[PDB]
Paper text:
The exosome and its related bacterial polynucleotide phosphorylase (PNPase) represent a class of conserved multi-subunit protein complexes responsible for the 3′-to-5′ processing and degradation of RNA. A large “processing chamber” was found inside the catalytic ring, where three identical phosphorolytic active sites reside.
To further understand the RNA recruitment mechanism of the exosome family of macromolecular machines, we determined the crystal structure of the archaeal Sulfolobus solfataricus exosome. The three copies of Rrp41/Rrp42 heterodimers within the catalytic ring align extremely well with their counterparts in the previous structure, even though the three-fold NCS was not enforced in our structure, the three heterodimers does not deviate notably from their symmetric positions. In addition to rigid body shifts, we observed conformational heterogeneity among Rrp4 subunits. The exceptionally large geometric deviation in Chain F is due to a rigid body hinge motion at the linker region between the N-terminal domain and the S1/KH domains, because when aligned separately, each domain agrees well with their counterparts in other two Rrp4 subunits (r.m.s.d. of Cα alignments for the N-ter, S1, and KH domains are at 0.3 Å (50 aa), 0.3 Å (70 aa), and 0.7 Å (115 aa), respectively, Fig. 3b–d). The hinge motion causes the S1 and KH domains in chain F to move away from the central channel and thus increases the diameter of the pore opening.
Residue numbers in the entry:
A (entry chain I): 8 to 55, 58 to 114, 119 to 197, 205 to 226
B (entry chain D): 1 to 172, 183 to 271
C (entry chain E): 2 to 238
D (entry chain H): 5 to 238
E (entry chain G): 1 to 270
F (entry chain A): 1 to 92, 103 to 172, 183 to 271
G (entry chain B): 7 to 238
H (entry chain C): 7 to 228
The structure:
């Protein structure tokens, strides 16, 4: 049993550690027999080892997550929502209302929506719920798209960044798991700078 | 057959509601004015095996044009000219939704519009490409490859086209092409009740229509093409050519600077 | 193009077919010529002839090709092999693929497609005799056929190709003018709404020549538009 | 007329020793509207790849219930060759697109995205032998530049035979006028071969000698790939 | 398109298992060992209107190749040589998922692999093939039509390809135009060429893989040999990968079989 | 590939049974007899830029055919005759278009109605090529007959150049199609009749009433007697059709 | 060329009412629900059937009957001059003519919303290919147990030097006066395929009509027994 | 009128069986036009009492009749169930709620109960003209298959492999090596121990297919 690196930059195929660890399943680690390999351009780490992806422009759905989506199509029984995933999400018309449809043609093609993934696995596309607090149709400000990878980075590290982006410009910017923040001048920019300068520490600044 | 496009590019409402409020103050989302062209980059001799090439970056639109010369027969149609063949392609690599195979309709239109603005402008004199009349002649193959669809691809296509032709060295090395003068194409988009110069992807997804005006250095109109589902007023066309021509002065100069005049 | 002539404007200000610089060719319209077509028309401009057929709003064959909020227009521009001087290959050329798109988009702003979501409206045109202005003759036949099919529209589309021959601004170009002239500027519009539907230029013009030809087309279009309204009118009651 | 491929000292027409690689240039993230992108240069051979990350398959009956579908394309621009090449996909381009796809099929962890599609498109801007490998490596790096999980990067070289002399990374003169041309690509850290072709002739022994020469040429490119992706800002 | 094949017919999650333990014991389900080819048969002159033809039955794989000679221009890309054109078609007839039209991808690959192995071995030369230089030349059309897809189609294609070229009767050019009555003589053939495919299934190497074995294999590698046991073509196929030792040993197992195969081929044609 | 046509448009079971009852008294819905053709019209020189053209209106079937003449080289296979090429196009090549083109070509070529050997300018060198493009503008049923009437008419309308004169035409050729509907034989079947028929058979005649082309079409089948009788009815009609054709061509 | 030599015999030594030699072989392909090989002298055809299966695009299918998908294709080495493998205008015609022949025999009503695929290759051509192809198809469908009203037997009757003849050879097709392919369901006496190419008098038409029917009944027995070599 | 033309013959499509009127129910293998009776398939003409029929000698496709018991193959895992191949012209569908006995929970099927590649024993709960076959895995011994070998046969010899009064069942269920479950599908599921004297029994179910016409068969099997 031996680990090979402290916390360097790691590439796909790069050997991490070998032997008997366990070690839950990560999409960023592949293990054949005893050897452990990174599967992504990422950052090696440990605690109690792991790879934090440094690259990745898609979002991978987890049940319970809060995402800001974009309505692509309206169906007869609901709405098709884009959530930056390999799969398109579906918001049932029932969930939005009070539970049924008097067959009528309501948000439309291009409306942003904050919602929670209520259901998702390997045989289904993500199903959205608009039930909770602040969940609903976004009707203002701007939606800033970022790599779903930099989601935790735009915040800190003890919520540090969140107060710094807000104490220079505008208001309640919402960092969704989705890699999309809803803003309410411009910030695109500094979230385009913490966006690209993320590799370099200690965070910040200005 | 020739059908209304199915899918599609969905621009957000709020990213359209706010784009118009920016127009109201005469500024666009990237910061430029309603009349400003996007930043222009021209890298001559990018494709090293081409007789002449240009890599044009216009905003986020990337276009590469290369030339290939050969000796063929002049057609039954006047044997006192060379040949010009324009082939434009949108590669399945330039945009997410794009698919492989033959040119598509937009691809054919882009090729045809660039062909006309080169041929009719007398920008490239074909009569001088004759080696011996009714016998052997130079054939100019111009292949335009769009590598990143960032909007206003017609204007970037023309810039690369002219640039590639000026970078072309003829062999058996003898000299450049019998080129009279550079030609530029300026696209003006009717967005809402505004006329906007060199539209980007978001602007192209919200516009009613666009009209493209091609100019020679003497500021002579040498090609017009209207595109899009929507219609324009007579006053929109009249004003769009005014806006287009004023920009043609600026654009011909930055083009020359890049083409070594 | 040769490099000095043949003569286009002749020896008194009259053209190679006998027209003044501001005269239209002869026009003949005929409606509902095809019985197994929802709408049909034949259009003739001098020596240019086109027939159009329409198949009213119907269901789309493959689902994902249809649109959720509007009808899909399926427009075709084709030339018969015997419509030209030299036998033309009946396989669609690059010219025909371009014109089909340009004609479709022209009609996209006239046809009230929002009325029939998830449907397809098919519009097929054949050029039976080509003598310049075909794209416009074809588009007008399409407009008339659609009217002959009772499919709602904002307005009819009337169009002409204004141009330049020997430094002279001319209306409605013939084949000799298209081939040997300096400019060929097809314009079509919705005359009642003063909205331009199709706009192309091939050749060369000055900013001022552009606006003079632009004016000549508009009054040429208004005459064609009158002939269209009255062609559909005969059904006198 | 066939040129002499090996002087006369053991050097090649371009000036390399039997075991030397051409100049390698790598550039990541060159396209803006593409989930991943890369440029790969091997001497005079230049290629550009774009990836469009996992997404929904257009027709439902062309997708797979348990894994993503790879859509890989090899295409040569008309001005990449010396004589203009017809842009319509030739028989050579159709063969290589399949061979490049299958090479990626063992590296790209497709099990993670059932019912989806991963699109990879390559363009050859300049050709000079090795194009299929340069294409494949640009593709591999572009997929990494997109953050799509992979078993290991793919590095490749064409090993061959010139004047009875076993050589590494053939040039245009050598592919055209040599005895053998053997493109080999693998996942070097897992010691698994991903692409393996031979065009020409070799003895069983010359086969195993070139085999070895390729493996060490591969390991060099492998580190150029790794570090090119690793030019973080550390 | 070049997409992952969206059809597997689905091999049962349990069928794979039984074929793996029938292995180990080092045997197969058609009773042969891991290094055995299936029963072979070659019928010369099967298609009477071809200049030369062969019907190859390799196991349940059935392939038919015919030749057709024509006088053409050469290219001004080198012109003291004739032509070889290979067209392989996996016919709708051979397997349930095959549909008709242009050659597919597997078709094109099979054609190009066979073409390289015939052209590069110099087995067909050429030789020769000029009737008068830079002016007139023989053009050999070789059309290989797979009639039944039973696995290891590549090797069956090569056997039929070589056998059909050996069956080819040439005719008289007499000034100009061809004839018939005066059959001049055989094709300019230096020697026969064979292809051996070894499939990596689970942890085993398997020679001449059938349909069931091809459906569960990781990958297969194909080795082309001349009679002097010189390697003249290699092609790897499949979604999966092999180790360096797998390939190293795959070529050993292929070469030992090339001796057995070249002699059975020779009996079938002289 | 070649598949059973999917788009069907469906025929009412009650409509067919009313069409059958009209057959039972020897009349049809358009009022004509079981042996009558639909009203025929032929407009020569309709497409002006063609060498020779014919706009045929037969019932609600409209067909336009134009000719184009060029100087090409005769094929290796017999260089002592000109060329005829027939391209049919249904305008709503498909399968039906290819069939129609091929059946029109055979009955024109085999009948020796248009002598190709006389189209030679100089043997083995330059020869006249006749392009025949037939364009079905309105599919109103029995399109094959309307295709042949248009083809022949356009050939007779064709003027050759150096203007010299007509083609080496021996005689006109007509084609008569007889549909088996229910238990009846119907001449010149229209759209509704084609939609309810088992099958149709087409007979081409030169002025002898000599058979110079036969083609059967459709999902269903006919008996031996049905065919025997269909040709007998077809031939009697050929006499009537040739004389209306000649009237149109100016003999 | 002389076709009916002055003695009452043909170029190949046959009488005016005689058939060329025939060889039929069932179940030749393993991956094919039904198959057959048909020889008619110098004409060789092979057919494969893939039993009722699902249609790939939903809207190309029929709610009440199976769709037949038939193909006629000639190999590039089946002719005297190399034939382009891309489907010719001839092959597209004959594919339809053979499909429509089989539409009246195959009981399509039993398998609504499905597709039945029938593929045929001509390995050797010498006139009669379209009928040999159709007969190979019929038998292949039977070798698959797809219910059919009756087998389809067919010959090309014809005319040479004024002499009405049965089962044309290549010389007869390309130099004779007439060529009349006829195929039918002999037990139901229903004509399934009928074409004429060339020229015949109304009387000659009816004479050759009768000659074909007796030539048909001979091949029909050869078909029934060929499927009966099960063992009976 | 009422004459039978054949004793017990091998029959081909389009072959005359009988003249005049009999009181036979509709069968896919016999077509009656007016008063004549014809075979539609290559089969076996059998006469019993007043009736006669054709046992088909060929047929590699299975045709669904309600409440049959088939062994199928999972091709696709749908959101609310599974798609299954049962050798029919139509692909079958096994509802998820049928298998679980309850509606699917919020985060279930990776595959788990059945995956792409799994064998299934199920009965056709519902099928007809407007619908594709719907399945049920409820009865005894239905559900997923977890060992042995599955032998595919022509679905048309299914009755023959079981034999008269289920007797070819136990003559093969007892020289071996069973339970041999002959599904109506043309697929039998064998469960031999067994390594490796083997149930190449498989070749015995092959010899049945080669000679269903030869009698008495149930004794030629040895």
């Amino acid at each position: 049993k031996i680990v090979l690196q402290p916390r360097s930059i790691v590439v796909p195929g790069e050997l991490l550690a070998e032997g008997e660890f366990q070690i839950p399943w990560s999409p960023y680690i592949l293990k054949i027999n005893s050897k452990y390999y990174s599967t992504v351009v990422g950052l090696f780490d440990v605690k109690d080892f792991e790879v934090i992806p440094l690259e990745g422009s898609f979002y991978y759905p987890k049940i319970n997550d809060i995402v800001i989506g974009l309505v692509e199509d309206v169906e007869i029984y609901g709405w098709v929502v884009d959530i930056k995933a390999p799969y398109k999400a579906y918001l049932p018309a029932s969930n939005l209302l009070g539970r049924s449809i008097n067959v009528g043609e309501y948000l439309d093609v291009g409306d942003y929506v904050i919602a929670r993934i209520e259901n998702f696995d390997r045989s289904i596309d993500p199903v959205l719920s608009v039930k909770g607090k602040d969940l609903g149709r976004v009707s203002n400000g701007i939606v800033i798209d970022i790599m779903p990878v930099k989601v935790p980075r735009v915040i800190g590290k003890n919520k540090s960044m969140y107060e710094t982006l807000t104490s220079k410009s505008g208001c309640s910017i919402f960092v969704a798991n989705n890699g999309r923040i809803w803003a309410t001048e411009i910030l695109i920019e500094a979230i385009r700078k913490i966006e690209n300068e993320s590799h370099i520490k200690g965070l910040t600044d200005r | 057959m020739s059908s209304t496009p199915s899918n599609q590019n969905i621009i957000p409402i709020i990213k359209k509601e706010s784009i118009v409020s920016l127009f109201e103050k005469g500024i666009r989302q990237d910061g430029r004015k309603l009349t400003d062209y996007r930043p222009l980059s021209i890298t001559l001799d990018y494709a090293k095996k081409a007789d002449g090439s240009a890599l044009v970056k216009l905003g986020t639109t990337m276009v590469l044009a290369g030339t290939k010369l050969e000796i063929d027969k002049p057609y039954e149609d006047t044997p006192n000219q060379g040949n010009l063949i324009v082939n434009v392609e949108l590669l399945p690599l330039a945009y997410t939704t794009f698919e492989p195979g033959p040119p598509d309709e937009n691809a054919i239109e882009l090729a045809r519009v660039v062909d006309r603005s080169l041929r009719d402008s007398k920008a490239l004199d074909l009569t001088k490409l004759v080696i011996e009349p009714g016998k052997s002649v130079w054939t100019v193959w111009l292949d335009v490859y769009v590598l990143d669809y960032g909007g206003n691809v017609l204007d970037a296509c023309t810039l690369a086209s002219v640039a590639a032709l000026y970078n072309t060295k003829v062999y058996k090395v003898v000299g450049k092409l019998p080129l009279n003068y550079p030609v530029v194409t300026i696209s003006v988009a009717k967005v809402d009740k505004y006329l906007v110069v060199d539209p980007d992807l978001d602007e192209e997804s919200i516009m009613d229509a666009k009209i493209s005006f091609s100019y020679t250095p003497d500021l002579k109109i040498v090609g017009i093409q209207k595109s899009g589902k929507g219609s324009m007023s007579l006053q929109d066309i009249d004003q769009a050519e005014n806006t287009a021509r004023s920009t043609a002065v600026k654009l011909l100069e930055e083009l020359k600077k890049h083409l070594g005049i | 193009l040769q490099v000095e002539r043949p003569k286009l404007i002749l020896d008194d200000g009259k053209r190679t077919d006998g027209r003044k610089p501001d005269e239209l060719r002869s026009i003949k319209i005929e409606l509902g010529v095809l019985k197994n077509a929802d709408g049909s028309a034949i259009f003739e401009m001098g020596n240019t002839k086109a027939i159009a057929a329409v198949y009213g709003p119907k269901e789309m064959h493959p689902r994902h090709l249809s649109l959720p909020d509007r009808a899909v227009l399926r427009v075709r521009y084709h030339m018969t092999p015997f419509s030209t001087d030299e036998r033309k290959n009946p396989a669609p050329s690059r010219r025909e693929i371009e014109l089909s798109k340009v004609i479709r988009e022209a009609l996209e702003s006239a046809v009230l497609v929002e009325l029939f979501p998830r449907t397809a409206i098919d519009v097929f045109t054949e050029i039976l005799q080509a003598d310049a202005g075909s794209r416009l003759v074809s588009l007008m036949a399409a407009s008339l056929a659609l009217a002959d099919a009772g499919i709602p529209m904002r307005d009819l589309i009337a169009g002409v190709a204004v141009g330049k021959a020997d430094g002279v601004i001319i209306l409605d170009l013939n084949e000799t003018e298209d081939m040997w002239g300096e400019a060929d500027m097809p314009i079509a519009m919705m005359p009642s709404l003063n909205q331009v539907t199709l706009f192309q230029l091939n050749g060369s013009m000055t900013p001022d020549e552009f606006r003079q030809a632009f004016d000549l087309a508009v009054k040429g279009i208004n005459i064609i538009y009158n002939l269209e309204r009255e062609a559909l009118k005969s059904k006198y009651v």
